[PDB]
């Protein structure tokens, strides 16, 4: 459970306000609560091959919630299903039961999310159900690339390998697809600070 600041290792409550940014008020580190990579202010990123240095950003692995939050729950579910990882669709105007950080820290009672709870999202709202799915995905180290289209695979290859890939002479789309995926998985690890098992 919880969020550890990757710099000073102070433990925080696993409490994401719909946002991946986390600021350690102990040591002032700024990092992604999804992959524990540093966040950088504009022009501050010290990575020499960074192509977005003028932007406020961090560098995320492809299985960070930063990215996978943008998937549909259906597709996330597909990744889990394909790997025989079980998840809830049902709970065991109340709204989402995830308890968030209280607006008043010394408050007595917990504050539930309360948001709309889609049918089949296990009594969670959309964002929280997705976060749940991704925690399962990350826990079992599932590779989202396994479900990429060729376009996604090209994106990923440029992003993580810094090469623009192109089909070979007489390479069909399936063969091209499998070639990009093979190299991606072979050369680019999943999140290295994402908690596993
Ligand atoms: C002060 N500060 C905040 C940030 C920061 C950087 C990134 C994100 C992020 O989650 O991407 C956030 C969280 C707040 C935010 O702007 C935000 C967002 F940009 C996108 C999303 C989002 C995108 N898809 N689904 C949700 C949610 C957010 F809360 C905040 C950096 N500095
Ligand atoms: Cl919100
Ligand atoms: Cl990607
Ligand atoms: Cl990483
Ligand atoms: Zn810290
Ligand atoms: Zn991240
Ligand atoms: Zn950068
Ligand atoms: Zn919720």
Numbering used by the authors: 867 to 958, 966 to 1070
Question: What did the paper state?
Answer:
The ubiquitin system, composed of ubiquitin-activating enzyme (E1), ubiquitin-conjugating enzyme (E2), and ubiquitin ligase (E3), regulates numerous cellular functions through the generation of various ubiquitin chains in a system referred to as the ubiquitin code. HOIP, as well as HOIL-1L, belongs to the RBR-type E3 family, and the family E3s reportedly generate polyubiquitin chains through a RING-HECT-hybrid reaction. Among them, HOIP contains the E3 active site. The linear ubiquitin chain functions as a scaffold to recruit other IκB kinase (IKK) molecules, and the recruited IKK molecules are then activated by a trans-phosphorylation mechanism, leading to the activation of the NF-κB signaling pathway.
Furthermore, we developed seven derivatives of HOIPIN-1, and found that HOIPIN-8 is the most potent LUBAC inhibitor among them. HOIPINs are covalently attached to the catalytic Cys885 of HOIP via Michael addition. The benzoate moiety of HOIPINs is the key element for binding to HOIP. The carboxyl group of the benzoate hydrogen bonds with Arg935, and the aromatic ring of the benzoate hydrophobically interacts with Phe905, Leu922, and the aliphatic portion of His887. The aromatic ring of the methoxyphenyl moiety of HOIPIN-1 and the 2,6-difluorophenyl moiety of HOIPIN-8 stack on the carboxyl group of the benzoate moiety and the guanidino group of Arg935, respectively. Furthermore, the two pyrazol moieties of HOIPIN-8 form additional interactions with HOIP that enhance the affinity. Thus, the 1H-pyrazol-4-yl at the 4-position of the 2,6-difluorophenyl moiety forms a hydrogen bond with Asp936, and the 1-methyl-1H-pyrazol-4-yl at the 4-position of the benzoate moiety is accommodated in the hydrophobic pocket formed by Phe905 and Leu922, and stacks on His887. The benzoate, 2,6-difluorophenyl, and 1H-pyrazol-4-yl moieties of HOIPIN-8 interact with Arg935 and Asp936, which are located in the LDD domain of HOIP. Arg935 and Asp936 in the LDD domain reportedly interact with Glu16 and Thr14 in the acceptor ubiquitin, and the Ala mutations of these residues abrogated the linear ubiquitination activity. Thus, HOIPIN-8 not only interacts with the active Cys885 but also masks the critical residues for acceptor ubiquitin-binding.
